[PDB]
Amino acid sequence: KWPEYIRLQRQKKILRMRLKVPPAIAQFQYTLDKNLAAQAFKLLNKYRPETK
Amino acid sequence: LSRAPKYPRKSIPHEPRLDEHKIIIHPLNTEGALKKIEEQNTLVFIVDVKAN
Amino acid sequence: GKAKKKGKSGAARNYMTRTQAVKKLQLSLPDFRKLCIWKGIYPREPRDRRKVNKSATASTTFYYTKDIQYLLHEPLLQKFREQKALEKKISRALGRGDVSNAARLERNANLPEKTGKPRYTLNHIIRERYPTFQDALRDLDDCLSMLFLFANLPSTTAVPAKMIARCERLCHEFQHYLIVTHSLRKSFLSIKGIYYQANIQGEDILWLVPYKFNQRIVGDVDFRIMGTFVEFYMTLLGFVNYRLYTSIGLKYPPKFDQVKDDQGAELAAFSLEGLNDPSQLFANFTFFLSRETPRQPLEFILRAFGCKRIGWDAVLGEGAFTTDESDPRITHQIIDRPGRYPGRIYVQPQWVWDSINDEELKPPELYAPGAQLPPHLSPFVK
Amino acid sequence: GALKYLEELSKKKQSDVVRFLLRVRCWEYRQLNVIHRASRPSRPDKARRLGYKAKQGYVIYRVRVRRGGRKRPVPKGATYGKPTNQGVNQLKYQRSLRATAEERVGRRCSNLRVLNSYWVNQDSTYKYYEVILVDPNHKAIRRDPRINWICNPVHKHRECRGLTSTGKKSRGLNKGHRFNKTRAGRRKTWKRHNTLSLWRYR
Amino acid sequence: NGKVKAGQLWSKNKEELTKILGELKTELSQLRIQKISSSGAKLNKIHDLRKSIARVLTVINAKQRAQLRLFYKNKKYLPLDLRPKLTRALRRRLSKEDASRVLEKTKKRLTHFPQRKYAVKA
RNA sequence: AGGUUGACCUCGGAUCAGGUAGGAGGACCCGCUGAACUUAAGCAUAUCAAUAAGCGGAGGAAAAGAAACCAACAGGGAUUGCCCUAGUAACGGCGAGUGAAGCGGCAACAGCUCAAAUUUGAAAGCUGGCUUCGGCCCGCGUUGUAAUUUGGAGAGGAUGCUUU
RNA sequence: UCGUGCCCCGUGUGGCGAAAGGGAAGCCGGUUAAUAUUCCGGCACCUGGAUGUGGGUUUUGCGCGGCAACGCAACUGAACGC
């Protein structure tokens, strides 16, 4: 018997899988893979904004 | 965590409300008390109603 | 009036188990044991342990409820919590990749590996535990034995190398105080180590120092709580050294030469400066210590009993009065090997201990090299 | 700015993406409590145009209210005076469910001041609103001249007096001929019209 | 006897004031004991002792509060009894500087176009 | 070490640090809810009355307030109040009755702030803690805190003088 | 000791509500102008706590006897259950 917030977040994830999702939201499930994400962050880590 | 306040809510601790001069008001000077003095080695006083 | 209930008074209220004390203080077990050792909370034994806790066994440790109440107001609890929060911030910075923020937050942690000092300051605890300098001098036996033992161990996670170096430096400062005040009285060579007895302000101080060899750390001891004892004892000995140097009117801490310590000066790396009779037994002699002889006890004893010109081999360290063995100014030579320069007295090391124990110069013919030594008697047992 | 795109997207409430988001958010808000704190506004462009800022002292509280008409609380739902020709099922509350939600949120957080509120979702049983509240005791609020008017004591419980947007809408505070009875206050105007003025030299 | 002037008490410090309060309470007790058994000038002396106790307690409290105000002169948070009373609405009122804060645009407009002093010819 | 080490999001705990609300009063004020006696021959429209009673919320005033206004003119120009408009327009079983507003004269006058823009050659903004009162930290915040703009305009240019 | 954790358990939920219900324990004699199972004298009991002495048990470690019903001044007993 899980707490209500845990049950709510799990059933919210389950409901978003159960329902039909329009393409404008469903296109976010396809992301960069590990290698391309690592190379992108390798480039972008040289260009972090200036600190205090 | 226990309380670690940045200021005391009451600046001065209160003087004790019931000291000995407030507990003992005056002895009783009636016939019953003035008999009990020699009959029972008992002294009778009028004291504060809150004192135990 | 109203009837009392069972177990609400007496030993049940008086005593508390270790689990209940830990839960009451809301500490971890290492922090609780460290705080108990630092604050002098000692285990207690009730007459009937079932009256305190029905599940207690023979290995159950009981403490005083009032002792835990006094521990509740120790300011080191907030220091523990702040250090834990700071470590969480350091972990967050390292996980986010901010190395500059991680280093800046790490420099506030006051790590023993980079300071040489304990992680948590015990200065307020020192005054609470020792109200009087006489009590400090009376616990100096345990303090000096502890720190002289941990002056010669390899670095561990509990006691880092810089902390061990600070132990050795504090011991050297105390030895320098004893040398300049001529407070050393007796010394003894046992099968376990070297016993030293001195007299400071009318208090007899006896401690044991191991022979300089590879000391074995076994698993039968609790080395981490021993390190907590080490932190408390260096915190005590620092203030003891400061008070003694101020009482004899010398500046504390003494000037310490890192180059000479690097070259191996040991006791010779310190230079004592002013602020702003058995003690002269070896005053007119010149000594030469060979390499097979125990340099630190021989130098300490000779300099405490009045010797001012002690030289040794170059491998024994920097700071010798002379290094060449063929120096004609040398009067006595300490050798322990199984070609003798004339006008020089060659004796074995036991001559020095016997002479300082009897406060007179022994006949050198009984202490000749290769001869059978006289028995070494205990100076403490009459 | 993205908030323009959010505005034109929120205008199209019957598109597939907005209907899907409204359905899943309706399920989530129905599973949550009747009044609960929202960590951030679900409609940032609407909150920003209504006056919300990402500043300490601004909070968002989400609330659901039962929709429909109002029933008079008489026993057995029957009136025993002169006949009214209608039932209690067709009585209408003169204020909005938005105003009722604002009052309930204010009673939940009585230490704050209700700035405004906005519709987020609805179903057959409930209407869902998000209410912006400002802390009058926060130093960041009190130091800002654009918002420290709400720290004055005259703005205590604007939602209980009808000083919010839905309150002004219900009170009919608009200029023109269509709002003759209510533009300056209905009962005040009635008293002004029904008072009798007698001067000294009449 | 039993009449202690406040001018003498304002020069004393804490412990002798506590002492004198001790004796004043003492002969308050014993002159109550002789009050219940006899009459005379004791009935005025008990009133004098009561007023002396009130004066001593007042002086002790005033000096303690003055010392506490001196201690809390330079701190951010004060005890609630040492804080100014005013009224609840006055305490919840906006401060003068927060009420006098203006925006940068308003500051520029007031800087360059303030209310001028002028006269009109007749 | 990767079954590990963490970053976020959401939801909780604490006699945590600092605050805030309740109740009274309620003549006047802002809303909600809401009669009947009475007057209509009686009486379910109506009148009393969008009143009394009941409920919630402020202040020395409250409220309203700088037009999605009035007008139809040679155009007036935020709100409020008085006089007038005017017992007029208009509404009303079987009629008892009900009933404004524009203009006009006066009292008093006062104007403004955001969202919708990229500062992007530098979050320039702010709460809290400690202070040696110089500042330094923990943070909030880019899902947007400062400067600028609000339709009366403004943004970009050109131009030459004025203002603090 | 990878020292900053791990293990066990389920039953829920607080308060008020009886001077006649349930309930730990006081009797006698005397005594006052007026109180008394409350005062005085004698003789007791109950509840809770700490810790002694005597006695008991134990080298067959946590008693002995009676066929039995059971007896005797003692005579270990946590969690969890009946």
mmCIF file with all atom_site columns, N, CA and C in Angstrom, chain D residues 35-81:
data_model
loop_
_atom_site.group_PDB
_atom_site.id
_atom_site.type_symbol
_atom_site.label_atom_id
_atom_site.label_alt_id
_atom_site.label_comp_id
_atom_site.label_asym_id
_atom_site.label_entity_id
_atom_site.label_seq_id
_atom_site.pdbx_PDB_ins_code
_atom_site.Cartn_x
_atom_site.Cartn_y
_atom_site.Cartn_z
_atom_site.occupancy
_atom_site.B_iso_or_equiv
_atom_site.pdbx_formal_charge
_atom_site.auth_seq_id
_atom_site.auth_comp_id
_atom_site.auth_asym_id
_atom_site.auth_atom_id
_atom_site.pdbx_PDB_model_num
ATOM 1   N N  . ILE D 1 35 ? -8.211  21.456 -2.343  1.00 0.00 ? 35 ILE D N  1
ATOM 2   C CA . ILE D 1 35 ? -7.324  22.613 -2.309  1.00 0.00 ? 35 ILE D CA 1
ATOM 3   C C  . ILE D 1 35 ? -5.917  22.104 -2.038  1.00 0.00 ? 35 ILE D C  1
ATOM 4   N N  . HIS D 1 36 ? -4.980  22.425 -2.928  1.00 0.00 ? 36 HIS D N  1
ATOM 5   C CA . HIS D 1 36 ? -3.598  22.020 -2.721  1.00 0.00 ? 36 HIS D CA 1
ATOM 6   C C  . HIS D 1 36 ? -2.673  23.030 -3.378  1.00 0.00 ? 36 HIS D C  1
ATOM 7   N N  . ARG D 1 37 ? -1.452  23.110 -2.865  1.00 0.00 ? 37 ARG D N  1
ATOM 8   C CA . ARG D 1 37 ? -0.465  24.021 -3.420  1.00 0.00 ? 37 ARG D CA 1
ATOM 9   C C  . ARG D 1 37 ? 0.105   23.475 -4.723  1.00 0.00 ? 37 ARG D C  1
ATOM 10  N N  . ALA D 1 38 ? 0.174   24.332 -5.739  1.00 0.00 ? 38 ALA D N  1
ATOM 11  C CA . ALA D 1 38 ? 0.909   24.030 -6.956  1.00 0.00 ? 38 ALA D CA 1
ATOM 12  C C  . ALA D 1 38 ? 2.321   24.581 -6.824  1.00 0.00 ? 38 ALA D C  1
ATOM 13  N N  . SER D 1 39 ? 3.310   23.756 -7.176  1.00 0.00 ? 39 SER D N  1
ATOM 14  C CA . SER D 1 39 ? 4.701   24.187 -7.072  1.00 0.00 ? 39 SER D CA 1
ATOM 15  C C  . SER D 1 39 ? 5.017   25.288 -8.075  1.00 0.00 ? 39 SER D C  1
ATOM 16  N N  . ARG D 1 40 ? 4.460   25.193 -9.275  1.00 0.00 ? 40 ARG D N  1
ATOM 17  C CA . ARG D 1 40 ? 4.598   26.217 -10.296 1.00 0.00 ? 40 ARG D CA 1
ATOM 18  C C  . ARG D 1 40 ? 3.281   26.305 -11.048 1.00 0.00 ? 40 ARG D C  1
ATOM 19  N N  . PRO D 1 41 ? 2.970   27.458 -11.642 1.00 0.00 ? 41 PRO D N  1
ATOM 20  C CA . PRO D 1 41 ? 1.727   27.567 -12.418 1.00 0.00 ? 41 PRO D CA 1
ATOM 21  C C  . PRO D 1 41 ? 1.750   26.665 -13.643 1.00 0.00 ? 41 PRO D C  1
ATOM 22  N N  . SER D 1 42 ? 0.614   26.017 -13.906 1.00 0.00 ? 42 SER D N  1
ATOM 23  C CA . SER D 1 42 ? 0.485   25.179 -15.090 1.00 0.00 ? 42 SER D CA 1
ATOM 24  C C  . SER D 1 42 ? 0.285   25.996 -16.356 1.00 0.00 ? 42 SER D C  1
ATOM 25  N N  . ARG D 1 43 ? -0.096  27.268 -16.222 1.00 0.00 ? 43 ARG D N  1
ATOM 26  C CA . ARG D 1 43 ? -0.241  28.193 -17.342 1.00 0.00 ? 43 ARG D CA 1
ATOM 27  C C  . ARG D 1 43 ? 0.611   29.417 -17.026 1.00 0.00 ? 43 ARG D C  1
ATOM 28  N N  . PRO D 1 44 ? 1.923   29.341 -17.283 1.00 0.00 ? 44 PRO D N  1
ATOM 29  C CA . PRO D 1 44 ? 2.811   30.458 -16.919 1.00 0.00 ? 44 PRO D CA 1
ATOM 30  C C  . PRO D 1 44 ? 2.500   31.756 -17.641 1.00 0.00 ? 44 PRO D C  1
ATOM 31  N N  . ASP D 1 45 ? 2.058   31.694 -18.900 1.00 0.00 ? 45 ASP D N  1
ATOM 32  C CA . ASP D 1 45 ? 1.726   32.918 -19.623 1.00 0.00 ? 45 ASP D CA 1
ATOM 33  C C  . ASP D 1 45 ? 0.486   33.590 -19.036 1.00 0.00 ? 45 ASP D C  1
ATOM 34  N N  . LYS D 1 46 ? -0.520  32.795 -18.658 1.00 0.00 ? 46 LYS D N  1
ATOM 35  C CA . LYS D 1 46 ? -1.720  33.346 -18.038 1.00 0.00 ? 46 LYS D CA 1
ATOM 36  C C  . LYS D 1 46 ? -1.410  33.932 -16.669 1.00 0.00 ? 46 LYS D C  1
ATOM 37  N N  . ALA D 1 47 ? -0.604  33.223 -15.874 1.00 0.00 ? 47 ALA D N  1
ATOM 38  C CA . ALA D 1 47 ? -0.217  33.733 -14.563 1.00 0.00 ? 47 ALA D CA 1
ATOM 39  C C  . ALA D 1 47 ? 0.601   35.015 -14.684 1.00 0.00 ? 47 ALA D C  1
ATOM 40  N N  . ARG D 1 48 ? 1.522   35.062 -15.649 1.00 0.00 ? 48 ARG D N  1
ATOM 41  C CA . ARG D 1 48 ? 2.355   36.242 -15.838 1.00 0.00 ? 48 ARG D CA 1
ATOM 42  C C  . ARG D 1 48 ? 1.536   37.439 -16.301 1.00 0.00 ? 48 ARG D C  1
ATOM 43  N N  . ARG D 1 49 ? 0.578   37.226 -17.207 1.00 0.00 ? 49 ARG D N  1
ATOM 44  C CA . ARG D 1 49 ? -0.250  38.347 -17.631 1.00 0.00 ? 49 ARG D CA 1
ATOM 45  C C  . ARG D 1 49 ? -1.241  38.766 -16.554 1.00 0.00 ? 49 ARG D C  1
ATOM 46  N N  . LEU D 1 50 ? -1.584  37.877 -15.620 1.00 0.00 ? 50 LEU D N  1
ATOM 47  C CA . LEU D 1 50 ? -2.429  38.258 -14.498 1.00 0.00 ? 50 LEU D CA 1
ATOM 48  C C  . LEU D 1 50 ? -1.648  38.861 -13.338 1.00 0.00 ? 50 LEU D C  1
ATOM 49  N N  . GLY D 1 51 ? -0.323  38.743 -13.332 1.00 0.00 ? 51 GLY D N  1
ATOM 50  C CA . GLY D 1 51 ? 0.501   39.448 -12.369 1.00 0.00 ? 51 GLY D CA 1
ATOM 51  C C  . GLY D 1 51 ? 1.473   38.593 -11.587 1.00 0.00 ? 51 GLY D C  1
ATOM 52  N N  . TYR D 1 52 ? 1.572   37.300 -11.881 1.00 0.00 ? 52 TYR D N  1
ATOM 53  C CA . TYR D 1 52 ? 2.499   36.439 -11.161 1.00 0.00 ? 52 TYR D CA 1
ATOM 54  C C  . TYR D 1 52 ? 3.936   36.726 -11.579 1.00 0.00 ? 52 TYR D C  1
ATOM 55  N N  . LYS D 1 53 ? 4.841   36.668 -10.608 1.00 0.00 ? 53 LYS D N  1
ATOM 56  C CA . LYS D 1 53 ? 6.270   36.790 -10.842 1.00 0.00 ? 53 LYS D CA 1
ATOM 57  C C  . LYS D 1 53 ? 6.971   35.599 -10.208 1.00 0.00 ? 53 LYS D C  1
ATOM 58  N N  . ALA D 1 54 ? 8.120   35.229 -10.771 1.00 0.00 ? 54 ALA D N  1
ATOM 59  C CA . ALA D 1 54 ? 8.960   34.188 -10.180 1.00 0.00 ? 54 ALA D CA 1
ATOM 60  C C  . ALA D 1 54 ? 9.845   34.795 -9.090  1.00 0.00 ? 54 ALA D C  1
ATOM 61  N N  . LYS D 1 55 ? 9.193   35.176 -7.998  1.00 0.00 ? 55 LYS D N  1
ATOM 62  C CA . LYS D 1 55 ? 9.823   35.878 -6.895  1.00 0.00 ? 55 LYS D CA 1
ATOM 63  C C  . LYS D 1 55 ? 9.325   35.264 -5.596  1.00 0.00 ? 55 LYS D C  1
ATOM 64  N N  . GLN D 1 56 ? 10.195  35.252 -4.585  1.00 0.00 ? 56 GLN D N  1
ATOM 65  C CA . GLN D 1 56 ? 9.811   34.771 -3.265  1.00 0.00 ? 56 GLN D CA 1
ATOM 66  C C  . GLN D 1 56 ? 8.679   35.622 -2.703  1.00 0.00 ? 56 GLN D C  1
ATOM 67  N N  . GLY D 1 57 ? 7.633   34.957 -2.222  1.00 0.00 ? 57 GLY D N  1
ATOM 68  C CA . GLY D 1 57 ? 6.422   35.618 -1.786  1.00 0.00 ? 57 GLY D CA 1
ATOM 69  C C  . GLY D 1 57 ? 5.234   35.418 -2.699  1.00 0.00 ? 57 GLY D C  1
ATOM 70  N N  . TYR D 1 58 ? 5.439   34.941 -3.923  1.00 0.00 ? 58 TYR D N  1
ATOM 71  C CA . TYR D 1 58 ? 4.357   34.605 -4.839  1.00 0.00 ? 58 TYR D CA 1
ATOM 72  C C  . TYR D 1 58 ? 4.120   33.103 -4.792  1.00 0.00 ? 58 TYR D C  1
ATOM 73  N N  . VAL D 1 59 ? 2.884   32.697 -4.497  1.00 0.00 ? 59 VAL D N  1
ATOM 74  C CA . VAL D 1 59 ? 2.540   31.281 -4.461  1.00 0.00 ? 59 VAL D CA 1
ATOM 75  C C  . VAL D 1 59 ? 1.317   31.037 -5.334  1.00 0.00 ? 59 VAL D C  1
ATOM 76  N N  . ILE D 1 60 ? 1.150   29.781 -5.744  1.00 0.00 ? 60 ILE D N  1
ATOM 77  C CA . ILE D 1 60 ? 0.035   29.344 -6.577  1.00 0.00 ? 60 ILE D CA 1
ATOM 78  C C  . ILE D 1 60 ? -0.693  28.224 -5.849  1.00 0.00 ? 60 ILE D C  1
ATOM 79  N N  . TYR D 1 61 ? -2.005  28.373 -5.690  1.00 0.00 ? 61 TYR D N  1
ATOM 80  C CA . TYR D 1 61 ? -2.813  27.330 -5.078  1.00 0.00 ? 61 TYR D CA 1
ATOM 81  C C  . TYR D 1 61 ? -3.915  26.891 -6.031  1.00 0.00 ? 61 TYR D C  1
ATOM 82  N N  . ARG D 1 62 ? -3.992  25.585 -6.263  1.00 0.00 ? 62 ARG D N  1
ATOM 83  C CA . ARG D 1 62 ? -4.965  24.991 -7.164  1.00 0.00 ? 62 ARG D CA 1
ATOM 84  C C  . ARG D 1 62 ? -6.147  24.465 -6.360  1.00 0.00 ? 62 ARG D C  1
ATOM 85  N N  . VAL D 1 63 ? -7.344  24.626 -6.919  1.00 0.00 ? 63 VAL D N  1
ATOM 86  C CA . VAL D 1 63 ? -8.585  24.384 -6.198  1.00 0.00 ? 63 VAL D CA 1
ATOM 87  C C  . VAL D 1 63 ? -9.657  23.906 -7.171  1.00 0.00 ? 63 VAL D C  1
ATOM 88  N N  . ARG D 1 64 ? -10.456 22.941 -6.727  1.00 0.00 ? 64 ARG D N  1
ATOM 89  C CA . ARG D 1 64 ? -11.617 22.489 -7.483  1.00 0.00 ? 64 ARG D CA 1
ATOM 90  C C  . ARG D 1 64 ? -12.882 22.813 -6.703  1.00 0.00 ? 64 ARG D C  1
ATOM 91  N N  . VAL D 1 65 ? -13.913 23.256 -7.417  1.00 0.00 ? 65 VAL D N  1
ATOM 92  C CA . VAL D 1 65 ? -15.198 23.598 -6.818  1.00 0.00 ? 65 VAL D CA 1
ATOM 93  C C  . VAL D 1 65 ? -16.299 22.872 -7.575  1.00 0.00 ? 65 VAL D C  1
ATOM 94  N N  . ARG D 1 66 ? -17.308 22.406 -6.842  1.00 0.00 ? 66 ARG D N  1
ATOM 95  C CA . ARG D 1 66 ? -18.434 21.731 -7.472  1.00 0.00 ? 66 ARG D CA 1
ATOM 96  C C  . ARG D 1 66 ? -19.256 22.727 -8.276  1.00 0.00 ? 66 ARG D C  1
ATOM 97  N N  . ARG D 1 67 ? -19.531 22.380 -9.525  1.00 0.00 ? 67 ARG D N  1
ATOM 98  C CA . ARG D 1 67 ? -20.196 23.286 -10.443 1.00 0.00 ? 67 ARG D CA 1
ATOM 99  C C  . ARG D 1 67 ? -21.692 23.002 -10.502 1.00 0.00 ? 67 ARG D C  1
ATOM 100 N N  . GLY D 1 68 ? -22.415 23.914 -11.131 1.00 0.00 ? 68 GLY D N  1
ATOM 101 C CA . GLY D 1 68 ? -23.858 23.859 -11.204 1.00 0.00 ? 68 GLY D CA 1
ATOM 102 C C  . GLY D 1 68 ? -24.491 25.039 -10.489 1.00 0.00 ? 68 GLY D C  1
ATOM 103 N N  . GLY D 1 69 ? -25.768 24.880 -10.178 1.00 0.00 ? 69 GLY D N  1
ATOM 104 C CA . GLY D 1 69 ? -26.547 25.908 -9.517  1.00 0.00 ? 69 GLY D CA 1
ATOM 105 C C  . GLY D 1 69 ? -26.422 25.869 -8.011  1.00 0.00 ? 69 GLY D C  1
ATOM 106 N N  . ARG D 1 70 ? -27.249 26.677 -7.349  1.00 0.00 ? 70 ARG D N  1
ATOM 107 C CA . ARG D 1 70 ? -27.257 26.782 -5.899  1.00 0.00 ? 70 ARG D CA 1
ATOM 108 C C  . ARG D 1 70 ? -28.612 26.330 -5.375  1.00 0.00 ? 70 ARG D C  1
ATOM 109 N N  . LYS D 1 71 ? -28.591 25.551 -4.297  1.00 0.00 ? 71 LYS D N  1
ATOM 110 C CA . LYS D 1 71 ? -29.803 25.056 -3.662  1.00 0.00 ? 71 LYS D CA 1
ATOM 111 C C  . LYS D 1 71 ? -30.002 25.756 -2.323  1.00 0.00 ? 71 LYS D C  1
ATOM 112 N N  . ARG D 1 72 ? -31.219 26.237 -2.088  1.00 0.00 ? 72 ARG D N  1
ATOM 113 C CA . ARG D 1 72 ? -31.540 26.904 -0.831  1.00 0.00 ? 72 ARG D CA 1
ATOM 114 C C  . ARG D 1 72 ? -31.631 25.877 0.293   1.00 0.00 ? 72 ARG D C  1
ATOM 115 N N  . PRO D 1 73 ? -30.957 26.098 1.426   1.00 0.00 ? 73 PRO D N  1
ATOM 116 C CA . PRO D 1 73 ? -30.920 25.088 2.500   1.00 0.00 ? 73 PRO D CA 1
ATOM 117 C C  . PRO D 1 73 ? -32.154 25.126 3.397   1.00 0.00 ? 73 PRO D C  1
ATOM 118 N N  . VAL D 1 74 ? -33.312 24.841 2.810   1.00 0.00 ? 74 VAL D N  1
ATOM 119 C CA . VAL D 1 74 ? -34.543 24.680 3.578   1.00 0.00 ? 74 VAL D CA 1
ATOM 120 C C  . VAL D 1 74 ? -34.782 23.185 3.756   1.00 0.00 ? 74 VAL D C  1
ATOM 121 N N  . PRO D 1 75 ? -35.381 22.753 4.867   1.00 0.00 ? 75 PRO D N  1
ATOM 122 C CA . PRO D 1 75 ? -35.663 21.324 5.055   1.00 0.00 ? 75 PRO D CA 1
ATOM 123 C C  . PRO D 1 75 ? -36.595 20.773 3.985   1.00 0.00 ? 75 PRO D C  1
ATOM 124 N N  . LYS D 1 76 ? -36.235 19.592 3.466   1.00 0.00 ? 76 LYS D N  1
ATOM 125 C CA . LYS D 1 76 ? -36.952 18.882 2.398   1.00 0.00 ? 76 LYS D CA 1
ATOM 126 C C  . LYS D 1 76 ? -37.045 19.691 1.103   1.00 0.00 ? 76 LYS D C  1
ATOM 127 N N  . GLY D 1 77 ? -36.217 20.728 0.966   1.00 0.00 ? 77 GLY D N  1
ATOM 128 C CA . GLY D 1 77 ? -36.110 21.518 -0.248  1.00 0.00 ? 77 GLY D CA 1
ATOM 129 C C  . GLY D 1 77 ? -37.380 22.207 -0.702  1.00 0.00 ? 77 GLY D C  1
ATOM 130 N N  . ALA D 1 78 ? -38.305 22.446 0.223   1.00 0.00 ? 78 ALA D N  1
ATOM 131 C CA . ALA D 1 78 ? -39.603 23.008 -0.104  1.00 0.00 ? 78 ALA D CA 1
ATOM 132 C C  . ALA D 1 78 ? -39.834 24.292 0.679   1.00 0.00 ? 78 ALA D C  1
ATOM 133 N N  . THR D 1 79 ? -40.309 25.309 -0.029  1.00 0.00 ? 79 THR D N  1
ATOM 134 C CA . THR D 1 79 ? -40.668 26.593 0.553   1.00 0.00 ? 79 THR D CA 1
ATOM 135 C C  . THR D 1 79 ? -42.151 26.613 0.907   1.00 0.00 ? 79 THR D C  1
ATOM 136 N N  . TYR D 1 80 ? -42.442 27.056 2.133   1.00 0.00 ? 80 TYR D N  1
ATOM 137 C CA . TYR D 1 80 ? -43.807 27.139 2.641   1.00 0.00 ? 80 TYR D CA 1
ATOM 138 C C  . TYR D 1 80 ? -44.266 28.578 2.860   1.00 0.00 ? 80 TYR D C  1
ATOM 139 N N  . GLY D 1 81 ? -43.982 29.456 1.902   1.00 0.00 ? 81 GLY D N  1
ATOM 140 C CA . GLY D 1 81 ? -44.570 30.781 1.885   1.00 0.00 ? 81 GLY D CA 1
ATOM 141 C C  . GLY D 1 81 ? -45.475 30.932 0.679   1.00 0.00 ? 81 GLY D C  1
#
